[PDB]
Amino acid sequence: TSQVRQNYHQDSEEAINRQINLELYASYVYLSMSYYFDRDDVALKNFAKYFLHQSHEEREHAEKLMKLQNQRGGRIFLQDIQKPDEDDWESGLNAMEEALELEKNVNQSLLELHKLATDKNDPHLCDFIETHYLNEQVKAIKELGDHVTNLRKMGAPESGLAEYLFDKHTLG
């Protein structure tokens, strides 16, 4: 048992390792999306930039959880980072829709983690998740929903003009 460990359940420690892996997976999904928009046959530079930013933000999310694991005296166990579900993301609209679904899934995982920290009477961990993760997820989800809505209302994905103009005026 680590000299620093106090009020930190084994189940919590295991759940934080699972969460680390999910944040790293999200970073990888966004990396894939970014470079799909960099293809010469897609060529939406501001979609590419938006998703590369999101990828680097998710890596920060993962590192902060690694820091937390060590702060509490848990032990980091890394797992393979699974490739994304697609290699071709089809369109700007579809990529936004997929991102929205990813962020809801990551939020579900975080909510389940909070419920476990609540059940184990770990207020530090509950505060960590609330302070650093839950409102980030609500903001992300809202932003992605807004983007999906605009793209749909503009006529995407069948209008290539719509996706072009959104790239310029919203993401640029």
Q: Indicate whether 87 belongs to the interface with Mg ion (CB under 5 A).
A: no
Q: Pick what 51 binds: a second copy, Mg ion, Fe ion, none; C-beta below 5 to 8 Å, kind-dependent.
A: none
CA dist., res. 20 & res. 108, Å (int)? 14
Residue 139 tokens, joined: 């903001």
Selected from 1, 10, 41, 80, the binder of Mg ion by CB under 5 A is 80
Selected from 58, 98, 122, 167, the binder of Fe ion by CB under 5 A is 58
Q: Pick what 171 binds: Mg ion, Fe ion, a second copy, none; C-beta below 5 to 8 Å, kind-dependent.
A: none
Q: Indicate whether 122 belongs to the interface with Fe ion (CB under 5 A).
A: no
Cα angle, residue 137 at apex, residues 135 and 138 outer, rounded to 5° = 65
| Beta carbons of 171 and 49 less than 8 angstroms apart | yes
Q: How many CB atoms lie within 10 A of CB 162?
A: 20
CA dist., res. 54 & res. 103, Å (int)? 11
Question: Which residue ranges make up the annotated binding site for Fe cation?
Answer: 23, 58, 61, 103, 137
Closer by beta carbon to a second copy, 11 or else 121? 121
